[model samples]
Target: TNQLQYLHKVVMKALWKHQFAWPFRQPVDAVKLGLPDYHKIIKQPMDMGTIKRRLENNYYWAASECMQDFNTMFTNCYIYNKPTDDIVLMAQTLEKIFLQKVASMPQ
Candidate 1:
């Protein structure tokens, strides 16, 4: 309900995810760099492009609210669908837009 709590959660999500996103997935692979098998989490390589797009769109809304001051992978962690000052509609808009643009390219 307040900025401090909201910002705290955002930071926490990023730190938590950063620390555990991969370690939890492969504790046995001591030599591996947090083997989380992004392929499984992402489902496809293009999926990362999709997520990146979602990040960009939400980024705009967050920017409007001045949330852009913060930078972290977890800034997207408005997880419980917190009703923000600006709402992000679809996460896949970036992927769709990219495919459209590329498809229309002359080459």
Candidate 2:
């Protein structure tokens, strides 16, 4: 409960920090921070040493890296028209748990 409250605070801050003096095309676009070698890192397996290094270094980096990995995973699955059953199923299970938790939250 406390952790979720903390996450809500962090997310709310990110969402509204700029207020009215907006500079970007969209509010969510404000979070865009570049990683120079983003392509190289995402191309390798998630267990690879470089991915571990970048993720261990920064929280935002870890989130972006994981998002990149998921994007690549889905794109490849689409292109090939097949699932790597274990990986896809694991992601789906995690998604289900998160969605169910959100769904159960009081309005």
Candidate 3:
């Protein structure tokens, strides 16, 4: 596994996209939004509105904002094979425990 470090580097480069680094938004969003509404014999509109709204709200279309959103999303967004609601609760618990432990540590 260690010998495949180069693969890790290559994959990160391909998968990780920052603001202007990649032309699209979140990877999950990119995939899910691409699905057609076949049940209705129609297609749902692929609106960039949410992404744009998020950008505007966070002032993230510019270079500085670009990096800001990029870092936040990149760092926070992760995949796991579990319900997100439960995962979020677990994450919250972990954060609380970590903060409590960290606060007790000597600086």
Q: Which candidate number has the best TM-score?
A: 2
Against the true structure, what is each candidate's TM-score?
Answer: 0.19, 0.29, 0.25
Predicted candidate 1 versus true structure: per-residue lDDT over 1-102, tens digit per residue: 233233334422342244233312221232363536533433212222233344445533432132232221122322212445221223223223433433
Residue 102 accuracy (lDDT) in model 3: 34
Q: Residue 45: error of model 1 in Å?
A: 12
* Model 1 misplacement above 4 A: 1-90
CA lDDT, candidate 3, residue 53 = 49
Give me the runs in candidate 3 sitting further than 4 Å from their true place.
Answer: 1-84
Expressed as tens digits, the lDDT of each residue in 1-107 for candidate 3 is 22123212332233333223242232334346563432233222211233344444643434333333333333242222134645345434433443343333332
RMSD of each: 16.1, 15.3, 13.7
Order of candidates by lDDT, top first?
2, 3, 1
Q: What is residue 21's positional error in candidate 3, in angstroms?
A: 32
Report how far residue 9 has shifted in candidate 3, in Å.
28
- Please give the ranking of all candidate structures by TM-score, highest first, separated by commas: 2, 3, 1
| lDDT of candidate 1 at residue 80, scale 0 to 100 | 18
